[PDB]
Design an enzyme around this catalytic site. Sequence first.
Site, mmCIF file in Angstrom:
data_model
loop_
_atom_site.group_PDB
_atom_site.id
_atom_site.type_symbol
_atom_site.label_atom_id
_atom_site.label_comp_id
_atom_site.label_asym_id
_atom_site.label_seq_id
_atom_site.Cartn_x
_atom_site.Cartn_y
_atom_site.Cartn_z
ATOM 1 N N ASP A 168 -14.093 3.011 7.312
ATOM 2 C CA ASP A 168 -13.500 1.881 6.654
ATOM 3 C C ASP A 168 -14.374 0.775 7.606
ATOM 4 O OD1 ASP A 168 -12.405 0.184 5.084
ATOM 5 O OD2 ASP A 168 -10.277 0.741 5.557
ATOM 6 N N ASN A 222 0.936 -1.154 -0.264
ATOM 7 C CA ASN A 222 0.158 0.005 0.102
ATOM 8 C C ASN A 222 0.939 1.129 -0.016
ATOM 9 O OD1 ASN A 222 -3.209 1.065 0.790
ATOM 10 N ND2 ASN A 222 -2.936 -0.677 -0.258
#
Length: 265
Positions: free
Chosen positions: A127, A19
């Site tokens: 999230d 990421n």
Amino acid sequence: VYLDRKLLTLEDKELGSGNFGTVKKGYYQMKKVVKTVAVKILKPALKDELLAEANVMQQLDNPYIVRMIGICEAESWMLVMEMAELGPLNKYLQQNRHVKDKNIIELVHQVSMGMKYLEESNFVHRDLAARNVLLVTQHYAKISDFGLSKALRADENYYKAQWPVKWYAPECINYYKFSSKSDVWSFGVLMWEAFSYGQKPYRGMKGSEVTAMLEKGERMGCPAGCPREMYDLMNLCWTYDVENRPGFAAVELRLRNYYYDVVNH
Ligand SMILES: COc1cc(F)c(-c2nc3c(NCC4CCNCC4)c(Cl)cnc3[nH]2)cc1OC
């Protein structure tokens, strides 16, 4: 908040990636005991992203939210957090198919308690998914992954973005507006995941097809064997209009009452 690298041992055990970089299991030498930890390891903007996440975790103190130990500046920037040894809720239910409904209810109710605290604190998670719910024990869940989290402005009930789309409410998709009520929509998706034994929501669908489905008033069907009360609650979390959608206080209460109906056979 600043940790000593010579006190941290990183284990050859990966807990996640991107990421961003990787998440590794580790051991941190405290003032007397060692603590088992999960270490988010960065591998210019990604640095400020990690520090803002650390700044959010520093402000939070609730039993149903993952605890941050501190930050460690070494070979890479590191975020050291308390380890939840059983791991993510979706993976757990995928691998442990005999968890009772009462037990799933207890776990999602704990998530709703943590979110009620986040709501009261005027932070938005952004999230909230089953993969971000961590199990300390089979009867103890904690909210994790504050990488997209925001502290709300004192004059607004929403954050405006200037993405886990299948967990996002229509106001997020259409207007980039994220409130605690947007997290309630995500919570409905998380409940569906938990009662589907960690199946991914909107299987085989593109993001734009999910948007179209929602705009026509359609929602995911009832998972096989899901209690009716829980599916009804999911549909209430999936209220299109932000104003009629319940907040986390109302969700927490409904789950709590239903839990006692199930506990008493
Ligand atoms: C059995 O498989 C697992 C067991 C585990 F114990 C863990 C684990 N990961 C963390 C973790 N961070 C990373 C997860 C954040 C949520 N999204 C998923 C990766 C933190 Cl902060 C604290 N305890 C944790 N426990 C992960 C596992 O499979 C990915």
